[PDB]
Subunit: 133 residues, 3 copies
């Protein structure tokens, strides 16, 4: 049998809808795309792409920790941008969170994001013990 | 070894390029993106985003059943929209299919979809027995 | 324990920033999105979508082989296009590399790609022995 666990953290925003913040399948954690929402206001943080990146990655950490993962167990990220010219600024914030054994990554500019956001970040991570060889 | 199975249903629109409808690896099913095509016509259903979402999710059910999965064993979906303003409507259709243990999800507006479609959905699901906690 | 391997092929452009070419988790290989970059010039190959598809898929083969995979062990690809009207030409190049047991796939047009590329291709693959039933 496969072990599925529904992952939720009240520290990470959860706008209404038929989705879960993350789903754990054995040791592989599939995270929903994260916007830079302030959990208190339920709105995007002010300040644009830098602030939204930072907020999204802080929010992500609550989901990773709830599942028994962490930033240094993230396998792959996808960065959806409203504007490819924000990449440099987004990547500088990304380096605040990802310091070693860096994830695989894809990045592109989309047509639009929900909530008129400047980005959205999706990730896959590993839970439990990880030997990096 | 890893067991791979090619998944094919004649009830889901057949591939119009060098791809399979889905690939099963052990118990993880990787679905290709699905459009709201009626296999009886080789065309999108009429009526725009709502109709197309419903037909895409019916199509998905054929693939899931062929592989030994189902909607309640879907792990992650990605919804590609031609217009972000269809999101609420697409979500209402989505809830006709996904009732519990909801998948992780990401949603965004693309530049263009194949067939000038309004909606495309890709998914990852689990086959066989699933114990949910 | 989950075994993670950091994949780095010297026959492909070395990561400049906080990402890796691919991450191997047990026998599942998560590839970064690949652009059609010439490893020597660190610039896209000239000639547009056809040339960039060929170079991207040549780069993918370097990364797959470094990890112990190959094209016939790719599970799923995603093709990010600058122009959906390139699909027919991209598919003709894709068929140079993928011959049998075709991956699942999604293809769509984005707003913009890094480096003003015409194409980016991401993949998931299997390492080690694979039995196709
Ligand atoms: Mg701006
Ligand atoms: Na800014």
């Amino acid at each position: 049998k496969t072990i599925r666990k529904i992952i939720s953290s009240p520290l990470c925003p959860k706008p209404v809808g038929p989705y879960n913040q993350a789903i754990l399948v054995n040791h592989t954690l599939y995270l929903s795309g994260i916007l830079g929402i302030d959990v208190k206001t339920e709105k995007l943080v002010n300040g644009g792409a830098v602030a939204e990146t930072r907020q999204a990655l802080l929010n992500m950490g609550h989901i990773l920790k709830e599942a028994g993962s962490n930033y240094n167990k993230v396998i792959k990220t996808t960065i959806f941008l409203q504007d490819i010219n924000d990449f440099t600024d987004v990547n500088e914030v990304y380096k605040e969170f990802f310091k070693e054994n860096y994830p695989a990554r894809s990045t592109f500019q989309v047509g639009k994001l929900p909530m008129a956001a400047q980005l959205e970040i999706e990730a896959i991570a590993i839970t439990g013990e990880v030997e990096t060889i």
